[PDB]
Design an enzyme around this catalytic site. Sequence first.
Site, PDB file in Angstrom:
ATOM      1  N   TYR B 122       0.834  -1.209   0.000  1.00  0.00           N
ATOM      2  CA  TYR B 122       0.000   0.000   0.000  1.00  0.00           C
ATOM      3  C   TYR B 122       0.864   1.253   0.000  1.00  0.00           C
ATOM      4  CZ  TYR B 122      -3.760  -3.274   1.247  1.00  0.00           C
ATOM      5  OH  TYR B 122      -4.628  -4.324   1.296  1.00  0.00           O
ATOM      6  N   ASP B 237      -3.608 -14.315  -0.832  1.00  0.00           N
ATOM      7  CA  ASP B 237      -3.277 -14.463   0.592  1.00  0.00           C
ATOM      8  C   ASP B 237      -4.545 -14.407   1.462  1.00  0.00           C
ATOM      9  OD1 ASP B 237      -0.498 -14.465  -0.135  1.00  0.00           O
ATOM     10  OD2 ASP B 237      -0.319 -12.323   0.280  1.00  0.00           O
TER      11      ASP B 237
END
Lengths: 340, 340
Positions: B122, B237
């Site tokens: 991010y 994930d």
Amino acid sequence: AYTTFSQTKNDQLKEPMFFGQPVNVARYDQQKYDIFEKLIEKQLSFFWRPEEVDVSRDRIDYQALPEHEKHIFISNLKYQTLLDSIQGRSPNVALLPLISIPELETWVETWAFSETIHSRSYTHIIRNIVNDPSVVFDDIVTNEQIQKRAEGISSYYDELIEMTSYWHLLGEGTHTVNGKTVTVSLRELKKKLYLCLMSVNALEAIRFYVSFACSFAFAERELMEGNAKIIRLIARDEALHLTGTQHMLNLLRSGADDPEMAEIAEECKQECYDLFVQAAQQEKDWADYLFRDGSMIGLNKDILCQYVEYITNIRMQAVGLDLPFQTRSNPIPWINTWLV
Amino acid sequence: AYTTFSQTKNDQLKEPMFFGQPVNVARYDQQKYDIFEKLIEKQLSFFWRPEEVDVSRDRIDYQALPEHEKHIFISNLKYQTLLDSIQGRSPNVALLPLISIPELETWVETWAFSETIHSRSYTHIIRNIVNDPSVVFDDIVTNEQIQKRAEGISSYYDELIEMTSYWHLLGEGTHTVNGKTVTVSLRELKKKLYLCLMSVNALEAIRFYVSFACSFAFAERELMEGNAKIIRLIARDEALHLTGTQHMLNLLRSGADDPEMAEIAEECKQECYDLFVQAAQQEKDWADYLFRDGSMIGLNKDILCQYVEYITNIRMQAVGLDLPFQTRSNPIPWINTWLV
């Protein structure tokens, strides 16, 4: 007053490493101390998987070892498994709740994760060289020589964890708990942290390096080469972990991070010297246990104990402690060849 | 009560997942529940580094977006960053001190580590698309809409951590601290855990998938394709993470692990249902905030709200909860291109 997301907007560049306001936003575009980001990057670049190392000829080698060499090898392996069972969980349980900068928080989590990989590699080795893996794993807990060290090491973590709980729950000052009075001092908590970090520096920088010597001594004889390949991956991570705590302790003592810490660090000097010396003496006593039934080509008690002294001086110096030993030179210069 | 290395030898196969004896030896040659080892192995095989993803072509796309589309994209990214800031630390701080089984201990640390990777991705995106990353990061903390979500999710974790602390320090039974009577119940603690696990299930299984839908909607228009490549790895994930909590919840509620849990699970089943519906409602209200200045090709408030309801039914059924919404086919089947 702990929280998983602190709602007040703080400047994370102006927070201390520890004991500030719990980290809210995990961001990596800026850093108070460059080292922690650099370590995360390095650790991520090192990512490896144990199960992709061929440990097949290691059983043959292990089974062919005489009783006392099996004893040297397996005692060492059990000790490494113990140490990283602790290191797997402990930095997360003890340090994470106290961190107040994001780069350190993520470093601690990345560090602890890498230890789970080391633990996994020990299972990989054990199940591939031994007949009954459970015998080995059970002995780690029950072996009287091993628990002595387990006891001392875990205590530095456990006392930090317990006093953190009192601080989070009651805050500073003197309190009453079921009649009995309990004192909660942030100064004492900072001391417990500094001491724990000093213990963890000794564990990774000294204790593990003694064990690396044992493992690589077999590889010098072209035995347990699968294990050796793994240890060299592990030691390469360990160099990072030890660098981490070195920086943490040195930033704490320099007063740059927290001025109260420099005071505490100076009032701790003797305890810090003492626990490093105590760690060294334990590793020397362990060398006695390893070689109680005889030695092998390239490693005996005298060689290992000199290495203990040599590496201790170097690690103590790096965190600004006095050198306890006259030893100046490395009796196993081949270890540098194995270390990356 | 808690120790980083429990000194008594125990059969780890007969410990409960939580609240048993703290894990001593980290071993992976045996498992009470196959799933946790499988998830570790899978997560390790998925290892990726965000910095290896080319996000350089994304800045031109982002800056080129109309203001409302910037609002849609950046609000989504901020929320994603919020959630995994929490997910990075919280499984480690909240669950780790309670785990009594080695495979689950290591899964939790592996899961938390993978979340720090998500957080780093991010930062990698934010830095490469905006002029001043600091305003994005600070708004995560100050944004009135975002903080509404943060406080709710934080509470489930924070209340578990606090009660865990009281239970470690004082043990169960009625106590007094500074005059005030405090009652500590292990049953109350187990409920806090179950509820927290239900909250984290909703966060990863629902909240993030709503966010993936927003991200992949840009990708359908061949915009923000670097971000899209990253979301693909993140979602892969996430599928593992929510599988983790589904299995934890289902093992707990079936009485297979702890009979007292099966009973507590039924006792707070209505609270669990209300928790998930409230999460679904929040996400609908969030979609409203996302699209208050207009929508884009492939996604508007109506379509996104349909998806919220669609996945909520699937996820609630997986953990044995009643379905709050109507039956419908996948409102956004184009999302399958990006998932797995």
